[PDB]
Design a binder for this molecule. Structure first.
Ligand SMILES: Cn1cc(NC(=O)c2cc(-c3ccccc3)nc3ccnn23)cn1
Length: 291
């Protein structure tokens, strides 16, 4: 932190402070993330420097010096959480929602093709720029560092986007967990409200069940044998997506339903989702960004 001049706190991320900083040698403005605390993690994280795609926030460097771990990322000026808050009177226009979803699916398809999962997608790690791009930040890190209940400064890590197999204690994640999260985000962009804003693991799980119906062996073979499944769960009926995400059209609702299948083996893949009729008329609009 002397071969970075000018260093400012951006926010508090899942693993430590995030700073905006200028690289000394190069003049470039970067995001610098301090990871608060392991050699297995270093090689794993290091591999992510090769995982480069236009819809993935570039990992520029892994700095392991002075027994500290810093990740240096490409810097973007706004996140989707802030953008949706700024867009709340009018909503994000459907063509821009569509562009963002399509781009995010391209990013997921890339990473999934290389056997890399995110596992903690949320609006705060989706970053936007002035050119209409959106990018996924922090891919691959959960496999390396875990996902805590609370961050270094005691902020509660959100459960809102967590897939039901994770909440039911399945110990092997698949790429389907990212599709679920993205489906949740899609619904939130459309309705301007989080889809499942749980404030505890059971509240999260029951909010899912009260919308999508309590899962059973018909819709999710194997569910009743999951580690944290209890036969005493209340049995709620499923709601129609026409009630959950109006005014989304039938193409959008169909796609959302497939992203929110209970059984992770039934849930649509990113690559398949890109071929969905919802994207037949996709475009790349310019967002209105105030920086
Ligand atoms: C991995 N990675 C993170 C980023 N950037 C961000 O996190 C980021 C930074 C800032 C920011 C605001 C005022 C002054 C300085 C910075 N505002 C937002 C709003 C949303 N994100 N964000 C770039 N790369």
């Amino acid at each position: 932190m002397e071969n970075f001049q000018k260093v400012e706190k951006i926010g508090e991320g899942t693993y430590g402070v995030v700073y905006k900083a200028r690289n000394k040698l190069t003049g470039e403005v970067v995001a610098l993330k301090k990871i608060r605390l392991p050699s297995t993690a270093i090689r794993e994280i290091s591999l992510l420097k090769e995982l480069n795609h236009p819809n993935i926030v570039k990992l520029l460097d892994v700095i392991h010096t002075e027994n500290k771990l810093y990740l240096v990322f490409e810097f973007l000026h706004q996140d989707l959480k802030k953008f949706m808050d700024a867009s709340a009177l009018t909503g994000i226009p459907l063509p821009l929602i569509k562009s963002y979803l399509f781009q995010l699916l391209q990013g997921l398809a890339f990473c999934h093709s290389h056997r890399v999962l995110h596992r903690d997608l949320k609006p705060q790690n989706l970053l936007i720029n002035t050119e209409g791009a959106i990018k996924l930040a922090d891919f691959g890190l959960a496999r390396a560092f875990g996902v805590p209940v609370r961050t270094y400064t005691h902020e509660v890590v959100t459960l809102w986007y967590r897939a039901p197999e994770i909440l039911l204690g399945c110990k092997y994640y698949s790429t389907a967990v990212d599709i679920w999260s993205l489906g949740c985000i899609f619904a939130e962009m459309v309705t301007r409200r989080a889809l499942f804003p749980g404030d505890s693991e059971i509240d999260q799980l029951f909010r899912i069940f009260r919308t999508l119906g309590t899962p059973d062996e018909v819709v999710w073979p194997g569910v009743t044998s999951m580690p944290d499944y209890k036969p005493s769960f209340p049995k709620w009926a499923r709601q129609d997506f026409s009630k959950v995400v109006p005014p989304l059209d039938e193409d959008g609702r169909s796609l959302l339903s497939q992203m929110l299948h209970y059984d992770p083996n039934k849930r649509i893949s990113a690559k398949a989702a890109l071929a969905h009729p919802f994207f037949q008329d996709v475009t790349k609009p310019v967002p209105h960004l105030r920086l």
